[PDB]
């Protein structure tokens, strides 16, 4: 029932839940932007992220598992299901400016979620979490 979590090389993070399986990446590429993509302020807004119930379910589980407050925390983003470029959701985890408080909350949630969270978001640096579908790695449990 509980989604499976995996860390390979102490830097590559994965999550699997039923038919859904994601790689979790952290870097300075802002793939999604509120000007172009779907703004997520309520769990139900995620119906626009995918046609797949399993991809929606796993995304909501992950966000709940890291302690995201759907109404009071900053909204996050996903690519509209009508686009063909691929399923993706993006959370701003930048430890800077107005986002610092939320970035610390996210870091805590990740440390509780993952056994050894290898935190790559540097203090004062733009750092965005992107979750994308991937085949469950062969070396994972």
């Amino acid at each position, epitope marked *: 029932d509980l989604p499976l979590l995996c860390t390979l090389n102490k830097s590559h993070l994965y999550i699997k839940g039923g038919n859904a399986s994601f790689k979790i990446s952290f870097d*300075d590429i*802002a793939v999604l932007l509120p000007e172009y993509d779907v703004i997520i302020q309520h769990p139900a807004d995620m119906s626009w992220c995918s046609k797949s119930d399993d991809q929606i379910w796993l995304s909501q589980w992950f966000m709940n598992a890291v302690g995201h407050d759907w109404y009071l925390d900053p909204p996050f983003l996903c690519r509209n299901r009508t686009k063909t*470029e691929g399923f993706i959701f993006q959370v701003n985890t930048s430890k800077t400016g107005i986002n610092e408080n939320y970035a610390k909350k996210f870091k805590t949630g990740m440390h509780h979620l993952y056994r050894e969270y290898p935190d790559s978001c540097l203090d004062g640096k733009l750092c965005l979490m992107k979750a994308q579908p991937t085949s469950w790695p062969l070396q994972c449990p």
Partner: antibody
Amino acid sequence: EVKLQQSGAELARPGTSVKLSCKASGYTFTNYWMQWIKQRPGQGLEWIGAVYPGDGDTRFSQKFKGKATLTADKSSSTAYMQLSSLSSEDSAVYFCARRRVYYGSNYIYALDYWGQGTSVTVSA
Amino acid sequence: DIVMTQSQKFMSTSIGDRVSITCKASQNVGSAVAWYQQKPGQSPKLLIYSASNRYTGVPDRFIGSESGTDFTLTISNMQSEDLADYFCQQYSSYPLAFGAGTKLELKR
């Protein structure tokens, strides 16, 4: 080998339109956004916009909205840029370049390959 | 939109000298900055990506570095073939933005 081949020099009258092409070879066309960049004589590079060939999604620089129309044909691995209502300010060299669709941290997201450029000259 | 403010449009240099070209991003872009070299009538060539990584076949003398929103391209020892235009670019997010460019010329 990766190659981006652009169409030849354009000569056009003021107020007309031209459609520039950039044919991609040696890679998966649908794994990249095709970028377009303008370079006016003796000046710098100015990013115009990009097109995703999967569904034709676009990104533009605010200045070029209403000037440039970006399309792509997946079957011919070709991206197109139509420049409308041509004026003297449109006379320039236009380059296409590729940028990978995002898929984790371990790819280069800068413009690694570029076309040879296409010259557009506007005159009556 | 993020804007890249490049240093001087023209720089006078001598062969064998250390040259520094700078670029300032209007907001934090992490390390998502590239440097391109262009010679007249040729396409730009990618030199540096991720602010400090040399692209394929780029010689050791091209050194990219970063400090917050300040990015620097250093040519440790300028060779005759390095006289060209240089452009910084941010690629963290659309719209992509280029610096205005810097042309290295020879002092005499």
